[PDB]
Design a protein around this ligand. Structure first.
Ligand SMILES: [Cu+2]
Ligand SMILES: [Cu+2]
Ligand SMILES: [Cu+2]
Length: 439
C-alpha cells in the first residue's frame, strides 16, 4: 500500500454520514506482530470520519465489548444530550448518535470512550479514531496545493498478544507504552511528493506527551484543537498533550531524510525507590527521545507561500463570571481532585448561563502535568503560567505544568449537563473530573 499508512476515511455523502461502527476485540497485525486490540470498525486507529459544516452525522455504535462503553465526540460543540458523558451502552447493545455539524467549525477532532472508571483501559487498548471537519478555507491555494496527512500519535504496550494491563503505578502516572506509533505503524516513512505538507496532528495517547520537532525545520501552526489560528505561527517545536490536536504546515527546505521526533519531555511521572529507610517517590525525569517517522523530501523542494491569513477569531462578549478550579494530587493513593473533590456523577459543581462568557482560572497545584479538558464548550486560552498565549484559536484541552494557572475564556454554548476533566485518562477514572450544568 502507500508508504505512509493512514486510517481509512469515511466521507459524508449528500450531507449525511450514516455509519455503523462496532467496538470489538480484533485480531490485527500491529508493528510487525500479531495482537488482539479493541477497535472501532476493525482497525487501529478507527476510521477517520470526514465531514463538512451542516452535515448530519448518524453514527450507530454497537458494543461488542465485555463491558459497557460509550462515545465522547471530543472537541465537537454539540449538545451534551448527544455527546453524553453519562450514557452507558451495555455489552451487546447499540446506540445511535445523531447530530448536525455546527456551521462555524473546522479542524481535527476525535472520538473515544468516556465511561467513568473504564476510559483508560479501553482507550489504551485501541478504541479511538479521528474526525475531520473540512472548511471552505481548505480551498485557498496555499492549503489546497499542500500534501495533507493525518498523524494519530498513540503509544502501546503489548503483553501476551494483548494490550498490557494497567499496574498500580499506571493509575498514578497514566500509562505509557514502549511502542510509540504513528497511525498504528512503527516509525513509518513519509515520502513527500510536494514541498509543502499539511499535517493534522492528534495525541490520542492515554498519558504520553509529544514534544514534536522536525529535524532542521520549523513548523507553522495553522490550527489548534478546535479551529484555525488567525494566521500561521512559526514554532521551533510543538508540545502535544494527551487529547490535544494541532495542524501544521511543513515547508521542506532541501532534499534528504528528516526525522520527526518526540523530544525528551518531563511531565512529572513518578517511580519508587528504596535506598535504605527510603521507600519514597522519585521523579522518572524526561522521556527518552523517540523517532516518530522518517520524512523524505522531494527533489528540489520549492514550498508554497504560507497563507497570509487563516480565520479571524470571533470577538467574544465581555465575561459575566470568573471560576477558579484547583487541581491537586494524592499520588500514593492514585487519587486526583478538583477543588478538593473527586468526581460524583450526581453532583453539579458549576452552574452557568448559555450564551454568556465565563473566565476559568485553572490552577495546577500538583507536581505532574495535567491536561485540562472541557466538553461541549470550546475555549480561548488567554495565558498559561502568567505568559500570554501567542495566538487566538479554539482549544478544548490546555496543558498545565506544576504550579501553572491557565486563564480561559469560556463561551457557554449548548444547554445541559457536561463534564470537565484531566485528559490523562487514568486521572479522570481516578476522580479528576467535575460536572458543569449550563441552563
Ligand atoms: Cu478526549
Ligand atoms: Cu471527557
Ligand atoms: Cu491529570
Amino acid at each position: 500500500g502507500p508508504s505512509f499508512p493512514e486510517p481509512k476515511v469515511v466521507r459524508s455523502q449528500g450531507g449525511l454520514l450514516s455509519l455503523k461502527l462496532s467496538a470489538t476485540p480484533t485480531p490485527l497485525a500491529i508493528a510487525g506482530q500479531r495482537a488482539t486490540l479493541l477497535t472501532y470498525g476493525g482497525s487501529f486507529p478507527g476510521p477517520t470520519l470526514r465531514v463538512r459544516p451542516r452535515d448530519t452525522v448518524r453514527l450507530t455504535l454497537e458494543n461488542r465489548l465485555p463491558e459497557p462503553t460509550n462515545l465522547h465526540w471530543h472537541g465537537l460543540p454539540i449538545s451534551p444530550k448527544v455527546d453524553d458523558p453519562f450514557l452507558e451502552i451495555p455489552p451487546g447493545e447499540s446506540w445511535t448518535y445523531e447530530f448536525t455539524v455546527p456551521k462555524e467549525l473546522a479542524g481535527t477532532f476525535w472520538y473515544h470512550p468516556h465511561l467513568h472508571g473504564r476510559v483508560a483501559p479501553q482507550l489504551f487498548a485501541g478504541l479511538l479514531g479521528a474526525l475531520v471537519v473540512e472548511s471552505s478555507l481548505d480551498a485557498i491555494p496555499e492549503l489546497r496545493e499542500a500534501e495533507e496527512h493525518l498523524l494519530v500519535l498513540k503509544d502501546l504496550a503489548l503483553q501476551g498478544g494483548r494490550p498490557a494491563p494497567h499496574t498500580p503505578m499506571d493509575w498514578m502516572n497514566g500509562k505509557e507504552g514502549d511502542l510509540v506509533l504513528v497511525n498504528g505503524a512503527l516509525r513509518p516513512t513519509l515520502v513527500a511528493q510536494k514541498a509543502t505538507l499539511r499535517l493534522r496532528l492528534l495525541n490520542a495517547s492515554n498519558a504520553r506527551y509529544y514534544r514534536l520537532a522536525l529535524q532542521d525545520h520549523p513548523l507553522y501552526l495553522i490550527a489548534a484543537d478546535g479551529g484555525f489560528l488567525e494566521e500561521p505561527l512559526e514554532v521551533s517545536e510543538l508540545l502535544l498533550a494527551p487529547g490535544e490536536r494541532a495542524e501544521v504546515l511543513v515547508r521542506l527546505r532541501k532534499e534528504g531524510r528528516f526525522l520527526l521526533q518526540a523530544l525528551p519531555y518531563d511531565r512529572g511521572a513518578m517511580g519508587m525507590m528504596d535506598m535504605g529507610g527510603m521507600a519514597h517517590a522519585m521523579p522518572q525525569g524526561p522521556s527518552r527521545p523517540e523517532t516518530l517517522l522518517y520524512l523524505i523530501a522531494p527533489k528540489n523542494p520549492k514550498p508554497l507561500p504560507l497563507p497570509k491569513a487563516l480565520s479571524p477569531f470571533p470577538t467574544l462578549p465581555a465575561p459575566v463570571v470568573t471560576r477558579r478550579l484547583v487541581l491537586t494530587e494524592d499520588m500514593m493513593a492514585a487519587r486526583f481532585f478538583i477543588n478538593g473533590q473527586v468526581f460524583d456523577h450526581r453532583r453539579v459543581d458549576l452552574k452557568g448561563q448559555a450564551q454568556t462568557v465565563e473566565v476559568w482560572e485553572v490552577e495546577n497545584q500538583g507536581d505532574m502535568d495535567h491536561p485540562f479538558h472541557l466538553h461541549v464548550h470550546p475555549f480561548q486560552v488567554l495565558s498559561v503560567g502568567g505568559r500570554p498565549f501567542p495566538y487566538r484559536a479554539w482549544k478544548d484541552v490546555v496543558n498545565l505544568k506544576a504550579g501553572e494557572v491557565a486563564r480561559l475564556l469560556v463561551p457557554l454554548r449548548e444547554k445541559g449537563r457536561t463534564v470537565f476533566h484531566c485528559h490523562i485518562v487514568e486521572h479522570e477514572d481516578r476522580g479528576m473530573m467535575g460536572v458543569l450544568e449550563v441552563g
